[PDB]
């Protein structure tokens, strides 16, 4: 009743077989202690994943095909302070969840990124403007020519 997460950092994380149900990859892997590689996830972030499962394994979930329970599902305050973490390592958490197909965790990390992308300043959006090419700079000049009477 115990299976072992083996990351790319070799750190054997022996968790319970019940915990493996959050990774659809690993839960369906349970038909084949038991180890499995993870090629990408660094073991601290994997530990964060395990701790998320430690909370939410007792908890309820959406049906993952939803509309309200996907889009208008509010986040957990546990998940909020659980994942107020590094910028780049947040992407790593999301990549972990997308790897293991831990979909509610994937959504929980995802919606924080959504809250980051909206609710950012219009000033920096005016600043961070063509940080990819996306235009010809003549069009950039024409758009700036359009709105400069305000700014």
């Amino acid at each position: 009743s115990n299976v072992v997460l083996v990351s790319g950092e070799g750190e054997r994380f022996t968790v319970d077989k019940k915990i493996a149900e959050r990774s659809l990859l690993l839960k369906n892997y349970l038909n084949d202690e038991i180890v499995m590689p993870v090629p990408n996830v660094r073991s601290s972030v994997l530990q964060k994943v395990i701790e998320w499962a430690e909370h939410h394994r007792d908890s309820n979930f959406p049906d993952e095909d939803d509309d309200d329970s996907r889009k208008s599902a509010p986040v957990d305050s546990w998940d909020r302070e659980f994942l107020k973490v590094d910028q780049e390592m947040l992407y790593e958490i999301i990549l972990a969840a997308n790897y293991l197909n831990i979909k509610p965790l994937l959504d929980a990390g995802c919606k924080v990124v959504a809250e980051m992308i909206r609710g950012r300043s219009p000033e920096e959006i005016r600043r961070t403007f063509n940080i990819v090419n996306d235009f010809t700079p003549e069009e950039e000049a024409a758009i700036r020519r359009e709105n400069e009477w305000a700014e």
């Binding site: 309820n60 049906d63 095909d65 939803d66 509309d67 309200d68 329970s69």
Partner: protein
């Protein structure tokens, strides 16, 4: 009382030119009774909804109304080629009050206030011919083997008939009579709902593989899968 606003008239007389059309959707219940709840009436001086563009569409959305059969019959006599009729926020629906055209597969709905059924519970009891309390007591296994517990649906009692009591005839016939409401539709998808009158009757083939699903079962329990 057949009357319209001029912008909608201008829309309909210009509607024909699409040839890339899907997903017609209406909201005004008055307007709904005029334009697609065909109601038999194949003629009006303007306001003609153009049989070619009747044909072209793929799916229909109906947002917010009170009853789709405020008349005796919420028909879809025309609109041959639909696939996805979807109901958002109508209050009461009879399932029986719909004519359900030729071959569509999905019929989803949500947020309603009242649901009748296609009253199939009565039609079952013509065939096996038992009492409703025997049907609710003798004829319930309430199966939760392993795949039923994939989802919760823990507001609801997820019932199934007994494999022992019925000799596998008046079971397949029972199941085909369940089918005869559906006219081979598959996707059903019950979101947020309120006030089913009848029980919940779902054919086995359509609940296995989860082509029907329930998201927010609140005012509702007691689903049988047959």
């Amino acid at each position: 009382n057949q009357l319209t606003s001029i912008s909608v008239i201008r829309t309909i007389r210009s509607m024909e030119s699409m040839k890339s059309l899907r997903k017609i959707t209406v909201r005004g219940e008055k307007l709904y009774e005029l334009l697609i709840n065909f109601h038999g009436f194949r003629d009006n001086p303007g306001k003609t909804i153009s049989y070619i563009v009747k044909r072209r569409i793929n799916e229909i959305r109906l947002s917010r109304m009170n009853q789709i059969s405020r008349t005796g019959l919420a028909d879809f006599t025309r609109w041959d080629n639909l696939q996805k009729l979807v109901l958002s926020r109508v209050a009461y629906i009879d399932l029986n009050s719909i004519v359900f055209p030729k071959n569509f597969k999905s019929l989803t709905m949500k947020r309603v206030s009242k649901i009748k059924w296609w009253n199939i519970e009565e039609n079952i009891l013509k065939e096996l011919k038992v009492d409703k309390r025997t049907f609710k007591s003798l004829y319930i296994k309430e199966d939760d083997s392993k795949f039923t517990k994939f989802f919760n649906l823990r507001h609801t009692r997820i019932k199934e008939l007994d494999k022992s009591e019925i000799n596998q005839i008046t079971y397949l016939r029972c199941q085909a009579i369940v089918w005869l409401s559906f006219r081979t539709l598959n996707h059903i998808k019950l979101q947020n709902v309120s006030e089913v009158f009848n029980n919940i009757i779902v054919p086995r083939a359509l609940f296995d593989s989860k082509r029907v699903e329930i998201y927010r079962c609140e005012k509702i329990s007691q689903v049988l899968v047959i």
